[model samples]
Target: SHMKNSVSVDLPGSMKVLVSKSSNADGKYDLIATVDALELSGTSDKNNGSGVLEGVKADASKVKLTISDDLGQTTLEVFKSDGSTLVSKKVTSKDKSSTEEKIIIDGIIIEKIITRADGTRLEYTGIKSDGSGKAKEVLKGYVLEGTLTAEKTTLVVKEGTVTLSKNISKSGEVSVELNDTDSSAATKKTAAWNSGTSTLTITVNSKKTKDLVFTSSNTITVQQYDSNGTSLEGSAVEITKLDEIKNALK
Candidate 1:
């Protein structure tokens, strides 16, 4: 038996596809179609409510897509440049009434930020990285707690009872310091790294200290070691000069 029928596929923006199908003797169907399409929503780009995209490049450094429906359901897809999928998140009306945001990078939610009207400061939580190739929580062996000050130049940590002050001096030199207080030992240790001088100093017990100064040239200097060893006199301090020997003979 042979039968023929026409079908229709409705598309957005007054577009449609007309299909023709015929039933063969073997009970299989052969199909053909023609498209009458005019336009597409959000294809023009620039943050359309229907859809949006970012970082569409050949190298695929970043790719993201967001789509929503009339019923308050939304879907988000984050992908890499090579067509590899990172993650897909979908939320419906019953779960969340408004849009839910996620800060995803390289397949990791490193941090998520949220702001509330009642709070004086913003709240955020995530696995934080210090640009040192590892997460800060893992490097410190525990979860670090800290608060940002109103001046935005200081951070107070509870684990070591440390406070970090950055760019506080008006000398136009950016200085960073890590101060740790030993409550039980009644001692304080301050470790500071200065960019201008290329030096690192560690002061302990309010009296002992060590300064590591990095020179621009090949020569390396060993700084003072308090309560242990002497500061290096100079390069080749063990070698005596000929002028000193002649003066001694005279």
Candidate 2:
């Protein structure tokens, strides 16, 4: 038989791909595919990685898969690429109405759930990267216009409300709320990013706290910590108007 059928599709970011075909003595053919960018990490760019899937009955119903990476770290990768192992997972299910998988991205854990009653839902947990504090996703009643840094650590919102997932620090947890019209729970925080100057201002209102702020140009000076082992607010660092600081503060 002549093995002559194949197709390819581009992924979201830079990655590698391979496809091959073979014919068996029984007159059946097999196709194999290896995708290298599915699992990524901060150091993923360090090593070129690959995965394997073999065996075929012509119906494309079943196959065997084995994954390998050149990087030294032992991690269960959901998507691995040149960037590093950016995502991980625990437990994968095909059932229609159950916890399909628990996904972790850059220390953030997300849940993939499916159900006939609920269809499907993605839920975020308050778990922090350092296992010290808890975080929650903010909700903005309206959309805001803004620009973010290449790493997404900094954002400037002109107006409207935008909620973002943020980090939890050893002091406490924090969430972000963008431009708003009128509300008592609202707080005003400022963040500026420029080639010569960059600063982030955070307000922690829960404990009668101080302004947890960070300024960086050539040298970085942090004011959130009055001293070692002491919080700038005297309480666990919680609740701030700055989303970017929440990520870097940890």
Candidate 3:
């Protein structure tokens, strides 16, 4: 059956097609290949009820993305440009040496967010670490956790706030030293990329804190076994412990 391009779609599925933003200046029609309406809520309420709604008018510079894969497909998201994932836990068949693992963000809930002063802090659970081989083993063998900054990111355009800076990258890669040594990455700040001997911890913050969004990232380092082989090294060392990392913002 053929579906006509309409203003809104009813709920029921994981994915929905995005037609066009109300702010089309040129007035040029959005073709199928041009703009695909996506169903973020799947089969939920029409208004979506959340303070955040999809469209260029939102706080984000670019809220609408073109998803090539399945709607419910879960993957560790690091960074994104348009719709393509810049870095991810799942690596293509091409790179097999390094473990390309993704952290499954099961839940992302904002505990406290002071819009005027403190912003928001989120509490999340259900994210799993998975990589290619050893990389997968490293994350699987251990646990990872962290918190996100509340000051939402917003990209400026001709319109007031076209894109929300909700998701921002502090560092590409990081290394955590577990031996009580503070990593150069610092406790709160993020390092785009880093490496060293320590129990590294990388945290991926979701653009949408109130709702659940699947995303993740990684650090650049060669994880290897030490002489004794019992202790750990050669990974992103999270200055704070797993529990500390989780409750850092709390």
Candidate 4:
């Protein structure tokens, strides 16, 4: 069975609507991507006047939306079509940036959603275009128009604590602790990859609260914590061809 179906609907101005449905040897899926007043199944969201969706609020005179879909991904972006951005926060650094969101509903489960600001660039990990694993979380955000090549990628050391940073912007910082393996307390895990300038860090947490779990069948997970000894945002990241990274010196 081989099938690939897509629909494109044009809207006011230079805006357009698109959807995708496909089935090729692997399995089957349905239409995804549309623009409307409210967000829902197979569709992104558009706002009219003052509105709020999924928690963040928007105050706008009028707004239009554009939705982008890739396999199981649905990025429902809401913004002004008149080339202006709304007052921003929660996704930006309080300097007036627009928030672009990607909400991936894979199968019957809703995976983690990452909200972002700056330009509107997103990367979906765990969800391969060839179709396999779940949509762990779509790293959705407005791309600053400049980020990639890993500049620090290609080395899969297979391994974070304290200072987590990504060069998406010149300044975005988060820290975690990764050296706690107490039976009673939560185990904090992390692995770091330094590019000598910007720390290309991958922060993760674990499912085993009572026990520290690392290195699954094909992937590796590192738990993150604070000085207060609490777990933080987590995901078991994947690596290719174990190049080798050192463990934390506790």
Q: After superposition, how far is residue 1 of candidate 1 from its true place, in Å?
A: 37
TM-score of every prediction relative to native = 0.26, 0.23, 0.21, 0.20
Per-residue lDDT for 1-250 in model 4, tens only?
Answer: 1114555543322233333444334433232222344322222232211112222224433332323222222223334434345322112111133233323333321222233442322342343333322222122211111122322111111133332222222132222223323334233444454434222233334332211222212123444444334544455333322232234222
**What TM-score quantifies how close candidate 2 is to the native fold?**
0.23
lDDT of each: 0.35, 0.31, 0.26, 0.29
Per-residue CA lDDT of model 3 for 1-250, tens digit only, reads 1225434332112223433333235543231212234223122122221111222312223333322232222222333345333332321111212211223222332121111112111222232232111111113123332333333221111112111112223332232322212334333222122233222332223111111111232222223234443434555333222333333222
- Where model 3 places Cα greater than 4 Å from the true spot, the runs are 5-14, 18-142, 146-169, 180-250
Q: Name the regions of candidate 2 deviating beyond 4 angstroms.
A: 1-53, 57-66, 69-200, 203-233, 238-250
Task: For candidate 2, write residues 111-144 as lDDT tens digits.
Answer: 3222222332323334355432222223222211
Best by lDDT: 1
Ordered list by lDDT, greatest first: 1, 2, 4, 3
| lDDT value, residue 230 of candidate 3 | 40
**Residue 231 lDDT, candidate 3, scale 0-100:** 38
Residue 47 miss distance in model 2 (angstroms): 19
